[PDB]
């Protein structure tokens, strides 16, 4: 049972990816239709911008604040900056705010969520000036709670745009997140595109293309039915009413923020869309260990919150069938990959190992071809290398999350165990198939296929090295940031 196992895997992956591509294109066409017919110089939704940061890089924080200040939206109420501060080290972010914005820092002795009076009037008196708050260190959820309280006590704000402390918005990023809120009276959240800008390392470039795929294909496919599972942290928008209703359960229930908020909007039976015309530039980890740690946390959150999307699907009627199927697909893909690798490793057949390798390479090449076509970029073919990352940085993270949820230490022991198992399986296959036979056509196929695959991967890596030598891999924003940081 080998041919069926590979053909089923190939169909199960590529057909769903193509369906996601088609749904994403339909969503993008609908959003482009919405953007057209919009009056020129449109500003109707009064917007409160909320930034939550904790010991941010001063340069990136200044860039984020200046990108907010340079935005071309004419109906922004004020900027609410909330810091897990109150300390001496966290005063540098306050000083940066003061040098870009008002000198309106407030240092209350308490966090709003822990008090018998949760109104923002105890810390705010003027709803006009941009405000900076130095909270005691409690967490992202508490700072977002203070932001919600400060934004919701002004009876004119209609929506809140939540951004991170490292995102560099484009001049029309704010305009393109708060416009879809005005197109359907059931849309309560909107997610914007997040783009990775620091593509100066191979891991960073692969993660950038993974982000491009996960936003412009997966999130677009989700948004065609208006059931986006996660609103991106770097750039999101929520109506103020849904914030008022879902804020309290979200704060009296760690890293599930922007995923539990989206989940609360989903169990309320409200719709969420994703717009690809709102771009926020964030960064990605350049280290394998930190990437694995972040993915372990994300997988913990995903397996913790997937059981709520599957019980709240019926609220959406028949549009939740896609949500349930996507959850089932994400569950079964991991098991399919694990079982397929185990079978190919244990059986140790060269003509099946080569077939699996070549089929996977062809599927990834097709995905990268579409990514290059959509992005109008020739660097998207670098995505053909991402199959390594998922195998060597995502499987151990998912296993660790699973073995933590219902059970170095635990974090960095399953990673080395997985790597040792993979290396042992490879060595076992090579040692079990050590012979040369140029008369056999099947051996010729296997050897030529494996040599062609290694040649192709080496050519791609050499192209990456040449591109990195000439600094051709760098995004234009990355070159601008390098020059500006040199100037500082």
């Amino acid at each position, epitope marked *: 049972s080998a041919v069926w196992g590979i053909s089923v895997y190939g169909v199960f992956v590529l057909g769903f990816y193509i369906a996601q591509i088609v749904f994403s294109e339909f969503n993008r066409m609908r959003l482009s239709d919405w953007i057209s017919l919009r009056p020129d110089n449109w500003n109707a939704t009064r917007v409160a911008v909320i930034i939550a940061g904790y010991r941010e890089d001063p340069f990136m924080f200044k860039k984020c604040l200046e990108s907010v200040r340079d*935005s071309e939206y004419g109906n922004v109420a004020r900027l609410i900056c909330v810091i897990d501060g109150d300390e001496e080290e966290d005063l540098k972010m306050a000083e940066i705010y003061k040098q870009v*914005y*008002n000198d309106n820092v407030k240092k209350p002795g308490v966090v709003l969520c822990e008090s018998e009076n949760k109104n923002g009037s105890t810390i705010d008196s003027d709803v006009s000036k941009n405000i900076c708050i130095l909270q005691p260190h409690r967490g992202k959820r508490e700072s977002l709670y203070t932001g919600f309280q400060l934004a919701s006590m002004d009876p004119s704000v209609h929506a809140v745009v939540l951004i991170d402390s490292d995102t560099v918005l484009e001049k029309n990023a704010i305009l393109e997140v708060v416009y879809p809120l005005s197109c359907d009276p059931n849309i309560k959240a909107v997610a914007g595109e997040c783009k990775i800008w620091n593509t100066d390392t191979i891991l960073s470039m692969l993660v950038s293309w993974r982000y491009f795929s996960a936003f412009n294909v997966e999130r677009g496919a989700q948004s065609l039915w208006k059931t986006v599972q996660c609103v991106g942290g770097p750039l999101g928008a929520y109506t103020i009413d849904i914030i008022n209703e879902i804020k309290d359960p979200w704060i009296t229930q760690t890293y599930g923020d922007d995923r539990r908020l989206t989940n609360e909007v989903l169990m309320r039976g409200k719709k969420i869309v994703y717009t690809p015309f709102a771009v926020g530039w964030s960064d990605s980890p350049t280290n394998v260990m930190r990437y694995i740690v972040q993915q372990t946390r994300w997988s913990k959150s995903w397996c913790r919150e997937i059981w709520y999307t599957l019980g709240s699907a019926w609220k959406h009627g028949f549009s939740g069938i896609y949500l349930a199927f996507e959850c089932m697909y994400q569950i079964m893909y991991f098991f399919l990959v694990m079982y397929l690798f185990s079978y190919i490793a244990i059986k140790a057949d060269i003509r099946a190992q080569t077939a699996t390798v070549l089929v996977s390479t062809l599927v990834t090449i097709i995905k990268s071809s579409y990514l290059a076509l959509r992005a109008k970029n020739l660097k998207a073919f670098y995505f053909v290398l991402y199959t390594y990352v998922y195998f060597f940085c995502m499987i151990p993270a998912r296993i660790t999350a699973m073995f933590t949820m219902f059970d170095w230490a635990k974090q960095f022991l399953i990673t080395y165990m997985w790597w040792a198992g993979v290396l042992a399986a490879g060595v076992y296959s090579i040692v079990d198939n050590w012979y040369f036979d140029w008369a056999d056509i099947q051996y010729r196929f296997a050897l030529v296929g494996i040599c062609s695959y290694l040649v192709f991967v080496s050519i791609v890596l050499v192209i990456y090295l040449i591109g990195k030598i000439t600094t051709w891999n760098y995004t234009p924003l990355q070159k601008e940031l390098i020059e500006e940081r040199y100037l500082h």
Partner: nanobody
Amino acid sequence: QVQLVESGGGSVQPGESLRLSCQASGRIVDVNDMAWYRQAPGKQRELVARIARGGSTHYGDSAWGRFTISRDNTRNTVYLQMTSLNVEDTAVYYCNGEVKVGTRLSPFRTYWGRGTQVTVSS
């Protein structure tokens, strides 16, 4: 060290304009936002209008349709236009600004003005 000039008001009859102009000082790197606060002889001070460099406007509880605010950022000045005044507009108007003095690295400092008296009586 910066000052706000204030154009000056006076005594006016109900139902006319004032054209309150507030001009900033000299050496200035940037001006972010400027507002026109008001202090009545009644209950404390309040806000009438606030204008930003990007054109966003924040009005008070009685400015929605009566007083407008304009920037004209050429000479770091602010203008307030008054319409349909009533006998409750007698107060002292203060100019509020956020100004840099030294350089880009200098923080934005909030500055207030001496203020002008506006009286509306028959």
